[PDB]
């Protein structure tokens, strides 16, 4: 997270850390969606142009964390994965189209003050919240600049109009992505960066007062570059595939 600040304890109880067994390192961010399900980006697990192919036995899921490095004994909870579900139409070849993945936990995780799931949006929520100018929130332990924080980082970023997203890149944008960040003429800064990937982009509803995950930290050209925006996997558009796998696989 570039140009962000420290998170308060229990500010994102759905934030998950994707952690590699050997070598012991941070892989990605992720989010708790229920007691047995975790949402991430498919690129965290599978990206053939960079030789990335991580299976279930290669990693652990660390929920309830604040510190990046510490083993937070009676706060964090470590889970093994049962199965990884990568969207079948995930496009690693061209543009990271459909950069989404589901992970089933071996055993359910008990909730606490530090472990709680986030809501997935419905049609009502998406229509109300997913508008240009509205702010969302990104969290993670990734790079501070294009450098490693000791504690979870947060940044509030506004949603950008589809034409501005299309104009800022030479990559082919689809309706399964949205972009966020400040325009050069806005003065404010901030972006997600390497290590943040798979992490949630959330909005709080002013109606019910719930937190909804609208996006997944996907791609961007550099970090916090002027005239450049962070691209996020559109959660609502892909919600039909999330329901399919959760309902089919328990």
């Amino acid at each position: 997270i570039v140009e962000g600040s420290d998170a308060e304890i229990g500010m994102s109880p759905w934030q998950v850390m994707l952690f590699r067994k050997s070598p012991q390192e941070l892989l990605c961010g992720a989010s708790l969606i229920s007691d047995r399900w975790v949402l991430t980006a498919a690129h965290c697990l599978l990206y053939p142009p960079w030789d990335k192919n991580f299976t279930e036995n290669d990693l652990l899921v660390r929920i309830g964390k604040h510190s990046r490095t510490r083993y937070e004994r009676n706060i964090e909870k470590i889970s093994m994965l049962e199965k990884i579900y990568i969207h079948p139409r995930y496009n690693w070849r061209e543009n990271l189209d459909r950069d989404i993945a589901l992970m089933k936990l071996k055993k359910p995780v008990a909730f606490s003050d530090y472990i709680h799931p986030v809501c997935l949006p419905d049609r009502e929520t998406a229509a109300s919240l997913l508008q240009a100018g509205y702010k969302g929130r990104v969290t993670g332990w990734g790079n501070l600049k294009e450098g490693q924080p000791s504690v979870l980082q947060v940044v509030n970023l506004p949603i950008v109009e589809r034409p501005v997203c299309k104009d800022s890149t030479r990559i082919r944008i689809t309706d399964n992505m949205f972009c966020a960040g400040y325009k050069p003429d806005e003065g404010k800064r901030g972006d997600a960066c390497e290590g943040d990937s798979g992490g949630p982009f959330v909005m709080k509803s002013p109606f019910n007062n719930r937190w909804y995950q609208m996006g997944i930290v996907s791609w961007g050209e550099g970090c916090d570059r002027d005239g450049k925006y962070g691209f996020y996997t559109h959660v609502f558009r892909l919600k039909k595939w999330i329901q399919k796998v959760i309902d089919q696989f328990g």
Binding site: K21, Q24, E25, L26, L60, R68, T69, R70, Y71, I78, M80, Q148
Partner: peptide
């Protein structure tokens, strides 16, 4: 950099 996690999580 990272602290060692219990060996129960690695087996």
């Amino acid at each position: 950099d990272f602290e060692e996690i219990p060996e129960e999580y690695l087996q």
